[PDB]
Write a protein that binds this ligand. Structure first.
Ligand code: G3P
Ligand code: G3P
Lengths: 330, 330
C-alpha cells in the first residue's frame, strides 16, 4: 500500500482524503495545515456539500484517528520541515496551492518524500497529467500535476472527438460552480476584479485553467482551442459547453455512439455517458471527470456542433488525483 | 399619445408598466388579469428584483390610480369581451402567454382594440419584430410579436457581426436567470422534465426560442444559427455566449470597434458596448437589449470567435415592447 501525506486540508485536500478511504492501494498517514486536529477533525465530520463523514473521527493526543488508522497532524509553514520520512510517505498530495513550481514543490522530497503530485495546474513547466488523456505518457518523473477540474473534464471529451472526427478548431465555456477563492459579498480581488463581486448574486465571467492547459496534456490539439468560465451561484458541480468544427463529418448520433463507446471501454471510469434529463445536483459526488449529456448538445450540421459534459469539480478531480498517485507509484 | 391596455400582470406586464411611466408617447389606461386592484397595486408597489415603484399607487374605487392617472382594472378569463374601446385603447400589450396565435390574439381587436403586441414568440405565423434587427420591415400588420428576450439580445449583435464580417455558421448558449416558470424545489413539469428540478439548487440545461427565432427576424441567418440555455440560480439578467465563424477575417479589435460603432450609431439604445469588469447585477435595470462585453469575449483565430453580451430579460425586453407599440402606432 502507498503512503501519502496531504499538504493542505482545503476543499480538495478534504475530499481527496474522503475518496481515499474507499481505496486499498493508498493510505493517508499525515495531514499538514495551519489548523489543529481538533478543528481539522471537525472539517472532516461535517461537510455542507457532501454530507457527514462516513466513518469514525477521534482526536487522540494531538493526532487524528479515522476509522482506526492514526493520522499524523502537523502545521508546518515551510514544507522542508515536514519530516515526511519519519511517517514515511511515498508520495505527497500538494494541495495548499501555494507550491505549484518545482523549486518550491521539491521541498517535499527534501523532507523525506519520494514524489509529489500537485493538485492544481503547475505554474512552471512541470509535467501535467490527466487520466484518460495522457496518463500513459508518464515518464517516471517525481513531481507532477493533475491539471484542473475543468481540464480533466474537457481533455477526455476533446480526445475521443479529435481521435474519431478530428477537431479543426473549438471554443469552450464552463458554467462553473462557486469556489472558495470567491467572495460572499462585493469584496477585494485585486488581480481579478470581476471575481471579487458577490458570488451568490452574480454570473461572473472568468478565465479557466483548462483553456489551452489541454493543449499541453493533448499536444495534438495545441493552439486549436481555448475557452472561459461563467461562475454561477451553485455550491458544486460545473459543466463544459464545447463548440467544435469537425474535420470528418459526423452526425450527432455518431458522436453519441463514439463517446458512449469510450465511456464503456477505453475511458471507462473517466468519461461517462447519459441520456437522462439530468441537472447539476445529479452529479454531486460523481467520480467520472466528464459525463456526456447526450440530450443537451446540439448539432448545427455534421461539422459544427455543441457538446455538453458535466463534472463535480471536487469529487471527480480528487479521485483522479489519487489515481495519479497510484499511477506514478506503479 | 397611444392608449395601451395590458393583458396579463405577470413579471412582464408589470415591468412594461413601470417603463411606460417614463414615456410621453404612450399611456396605460387599463389592465386585465385575475387579481384585484388591491393585490394588483401591491405587486406594483413592491418588487424583489427592481425595488419599490417610484411614484404614487392608490386603489380608489376598485380601480388603480397611478401617479394621478386612473387605470381601469378588470378580470376576463376570455379576452373576447374586454370592452377595450370603452377605455379607447389603441394597442394591447398581450402579456399572458396564453393567446400566442392570431385567432386567440384577434379577440383583442374583436373586443375594441385596434392593434395587439404579443409579448412573446408567436406560436403561429404572426410576424415577429426585434428593434435593431428588423423594425423597418413592419407592414401595417394589426397583430405582432416582439419575440423573446434572448432573441432581442442575440438578433442585434448577430446582425452587426453578420453585416460586417458575415456569419458562416454559429452556435449559442445563454446562461439564463430563473423565471416564474421554474420550480423552487423539485416538482412537476410534464413537458420539461429538467425544468421542474429545484431552480435555486441547479444549473438546468434548457431550450430557447432565440435559437432559430433569429433566422426569422434576420432572414439572412436562417439556418445558420441555433442554440440552447443553462438556467442558473440568479433572479434576473442573463447573457448570450455566441460562438461564430466569420467569412471575412477580423481581429478582435475590429469586432470591438464594429459593435461599439453600432451602439453609438444606428443601434443606439438597443446595442450597448462596455469594456469594464462587469457582472450580472451590473445590468439589473439595463434598458439596452444587448450590451456587448468586450473583455469577456475571446478569439481563437481571425475566423472563430466567442462573443459575450448581457441583457436584463425583464427590463430590456419590456422597454422594446413599448418601442414596438410606438412603431406600429406611428
Ligand atoms: C477545479 O480545479 C477548480 O474549482 C476550477 O478551476 P478551472 O481552471 O476552471 O478548471
Ligand atoms: C425572456 O423573454 C424570458 O425570461 C426568457 O426566454 P428565452 O427564450 O430564453 O429568451
Amino acid at each position: 500500500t502507498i503512503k501519502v501525506g496531504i499538504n493542505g486540508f482545503g476543499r480538495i485536500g478534504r475530499i481527496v482524503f474522503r475518496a481515499a478511504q474507499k481505496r486499498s492501494d493508498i493510505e493517508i498517514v499525515a495531514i499538514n495545515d495551519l489548523l489543529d486536529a481538533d478543528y481539522m477533525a471537525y472539517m472532516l465530520k461535517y461537510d455542507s456539500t457532501h454530507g457527514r463523514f462516513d466513518g469514525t473521527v477521534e482526536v487522540k493526543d494531538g493526532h487524528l484517528i479515522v476509522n482506526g488508522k492514526k493520522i499524523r497532524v502537523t502545521a508546518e509553514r515551510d514544507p522542508a520541515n515536514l519530516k515526511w520520512d519519519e511517517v514515511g510517505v511515498d508520495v505527497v498530495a500538494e494541495a495548499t496551492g501555494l507550491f505549484l513550481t518545482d523549486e518550491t514543490a521539491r521541498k517535499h522530497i527534501t523532507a523525506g518524500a519520494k514524489k509529489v503530485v500537485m493538485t492544481g495546474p503547475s505554474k512552471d513547466n512541470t509535467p501535467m497529467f490527466v487520466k484518460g488523456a495522457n496518463f500513459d505518457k508518464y515518464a517516471g518523473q517525481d513531481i507532477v500535476s493533475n491539471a484542473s477540474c475543468t481540464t480533466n473534464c474537457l481533455a477526455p471529451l476533446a480526445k475521443v472527438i479529435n481521435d474519431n472526427f478530428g477537431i479543426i478548431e473549438g471554443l469552450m465555456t464552463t458554467v462553473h460552480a462557486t469556489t472558495a477563492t470567491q467572495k460572499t459579498v462585493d469584496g477585494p480581488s485585486h488581480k481579478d476584479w470581476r471575481g471579487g463581486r458577490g458570488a451568490s448574486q452574480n454570473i461572473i465571467p472568468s478565465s479557466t485553467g483548462a483553456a489551452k492547459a489541454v493543449g499541453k496534456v493533448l499536444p495534438e490539439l495545441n493552439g486549436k482551442l481555448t475557452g472561459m468560465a461563467f461562475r454561477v451561484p451553485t455550491p458544486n458541480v460545473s459543466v463544459v459547453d464545447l463548440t467544435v468544427r469537425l474535420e470528418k463529418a459526423a452526425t450527432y448520433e455518431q458522436i453519441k455512439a463514439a463517446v458512449k463507446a469510450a465511456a464503456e471501454g477505453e475511458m471507462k471510469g473517466v468519461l461517462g455517458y447519459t441520456e437522462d434529463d439530468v441537472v447539476s445536483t445529479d452529479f454531486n459526488g460523481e467520480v467520472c471527470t466528464s459525463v456526456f449529456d447526450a440530450k443537451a448538445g446540439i448539432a448545427l450540421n455534421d461539422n459544427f456542433v455543441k457538446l455538453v459534459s458535466w463534472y463535480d469539480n471536487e469529487t471527480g478531480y480528487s479521485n483522479k488525483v489519487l489515481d495519479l498517485i497510484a499511477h506514478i507509484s506503479k
